């Protein structure tokens, strides 16, 4: 351990996974996908009670890196699409499957896939200078991260559409109101308050946390995986299109 | 098919800026939906579904969004009596709701004033709902001895939480625009004086987005769910047929 | 004829009142049985509307701690299996109740008495009511269908702070998060709720019952399956080191 694009630390029964490309506003590139997956696969097995994701610097994440498309393979755009789809599908699935309580500490602006995944977390704490933006249809794409299913359930289809289809950008307050964020904190004391709270959580009976989440999450996974898959076919097609 | 605007008796249907605008137009009768308007609304959507607008809006003329079903749809009695009137109204309603379940473009309600009954329950099928601060929402079904429809027995609990949906479908609490926005039914409320302006500016923008992206995105959200909604619709209609032949309705 | 409840019927409203105010209305083995018999009764009688409420200062403190300590001939193995069967059957009554069901939350609520709220048709609370499900704190898993209903009602984000991390909600929070229908100031709480309920009871009776039926029926089979699953996982949690 061992990471180029992340900083993975483990203290107090809390594994903290920190995006670490602050220069590029924590954009998620092909390597970071793989690293995130390995970090979660690792934290799912270790003996931490609780797993956090957060961003280094001013951004939570700007979502997918624009350079994941431009690197072109031997089978042309046909194969790059199919390869990205496979990777994405697998990537989302790790979140669907993660067995321990998973928490997002949103430290600043979030975009794209980093936002859509938030529907799979167990809690989401945000600073009052975080924002949430999924401008999919602006860039000719469809939703992913299961968001086509989770976001209507969480926000109401009325509010979900303004965001997935019309690309409205939410403030932390709005996102909290619309169910996406668990709580907002003023920026100055953001880091302190979350961590105090997380530390307490990590002191709760460990199998109880793991089993409780199991009961809430299990019955629902098969559906999510099927949504993931469907989302990915539609996304593969969207990438080979004139509008993208 | 049609060129810029379509000939209807109870509606005004126009197409401008990749937006198809369907307006209820019986402002004298608070835009009450009568048998003819049902048919026209279906033909209007069928049209908007096939033309080359990006976005479809539903709105009311005058002060009301709609008062819901027209009371005069019951009194016009056929040769088979109330038995057949009920069966016919149940068939029409089922088919009518179905159009909304199946509509493939983004569908938006511009609620310019008080909405009632079917005009409210159908809101659970829309993609956005923008309301003026003097819009209200009211579904007093059980008060007139009836059961819910528009898929609202499924969508309203999902959207509002069963706790809040019941005060509305079962106990006929009327909501203000702000309440309805808070409870998930309305996307956004606007002050009346600037309501029309604001909504249309925003809509014009939306219409400028990549057309196939909007259509495909909606499809991904909406498709896996239709089969269930059609089932709910069907079930709501049988239960409603029954309710119309009962003592509590008269 | 009830030991732990007070069941009355007036104005087409059946009122079921928890009545162990000395013990903060804790639900013991007997009260489970009585609540079931009371509902089974109210389901068949000619009331339009059924209310649950608490005597005294508490709505309910949830399960009584003395339901575990009374030990049977088959040891902890059988106690667990019996409690699981009872609980499953008990929750089922709420899943199945056919008339409109309303909780008048007069004060603090805990545990099973909170989780069941996801099954009610309305929930009116006094501004001094609170809602707390500290399951994982006592090494247990959720029940009352709450592992399914609470994410649907509150959003998984907010449901988790409650079922997994045991955050205690105030009535205002609970109302905001979708759990409670409306909050009333304590001084006029009783008055206001009953006025409203008396009105509701004057609505066309079959319309109420049929409307509820249309909202609720398609959804029961799932809830029963959730209830069952929740109970097996709970049985296991009782035979564990963390409990
Ligand atoms: Cl990718
Ligand atoms: Cl009709
Ligand atoms: Cl028990």
UniProtKB/Swiss-Prot annotation, chain C:
The modification N6-succinyllysine is found at residues 24, 152. The keyword Phosphoprotein applies. Pathway: Lipid metabolism; fatty acid beta-oxidation. GO terms for molecular function: delta(3)-delta(2)-enoyl-CoA isomerase activity; fatty-acyl-CoA binding. Keywords: Acetylation, Isomerase, Mitochondrion, Peroxisome, Phosphoprotein, Transit peptide. Abundant in heart, skeletal muscle and liver. Expressed in CD34(+) T-cells and CD34(+) bone marrow cells. GO terms for biological process: fatty acid beta-oxidation; fatty acid catabolic process. The record marks 143 as: Important for catalytic activity. Residues 14-185 are annotated as: ECH-like. One of its GO terms (cellular component) is peroxisome. It is an enzyme of class 5 (isomerase). Substrate binds at residues 61-65. Its EC number is 5.3.3.8. It catalyses: a (3Z)-enoyl-CoA = a 4-saturated (2E)-enoyl-CoA; (3Z)-octenoyl-CoA = (2E)-octenoyl-CoA; a (3E)-enoyl-CoA = a 4-saturated (2E)-enoyl-CoA; (2E)-tetradecenoyl-CoA = (3Z)-tetradecenoyl-CoA. Able to isomerize both 3-cis and 3-trans double bonds into the 2-trans form in a range of enoyl-CoA species. Has a preference for 3-trans substrates. In the C-terminal section; belongs to the enoyl-CoA hydratase/isomerase family. This is Enoyl-CoA delta isomerase 2.
């Amino acid at each position: 351990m061992g990471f180029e694009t992340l900083v993975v630390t483990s203290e107090d029964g809390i594994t903290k996974i920190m995006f670490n490309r602050p220069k590029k506003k924590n954009a998620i590139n092909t390597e970071m996908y793989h690293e995130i997956m390995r970090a979660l696969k690792a934290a799912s097995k270790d003996d931490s009670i609780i797993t956090v994701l957060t961003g280094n610097g001013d951004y939570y994440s700007s979502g997918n890196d624009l350079t994941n498309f431009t690197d072109i393979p031997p089978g042309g755009v046909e194969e790059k699409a199919k390869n990205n789809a496979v990777l994405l599908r697998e990537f989302v699935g790790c979140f669907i499957d993660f067995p321990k309580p998973l928490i997002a500490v949103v430290n600043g602006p979030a975009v794209g896939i980093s936002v859509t995944l938030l529907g799979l977390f167990d809690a989401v704490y945000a600073s009052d200078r975080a924002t949430f933006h999924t401008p999919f249809s602006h860039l000719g794409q469809s939703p992913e991260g299961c968001s086509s299913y989770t976001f209507p359930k969480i926000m109401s289809p009325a509010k979900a559409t303004e965001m997935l289809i019309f690309g409205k950008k939410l403030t932390a307050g709005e996102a909290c109101a619309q169910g996406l964020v668990t709580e907002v904190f003023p920026d100055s004391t953001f880091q302190k308050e979350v961590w105090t709270r997380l530390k307490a959580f990590a002191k709760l009976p460990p199998n109880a946390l793991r089993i409780s989440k199991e009961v809430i999450r299990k019955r629902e996974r098969e559906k999510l995986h099927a949504v993931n898959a469907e989302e990915c076919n539609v996304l593969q097609g969207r990438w080979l299109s004139d509008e993208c």
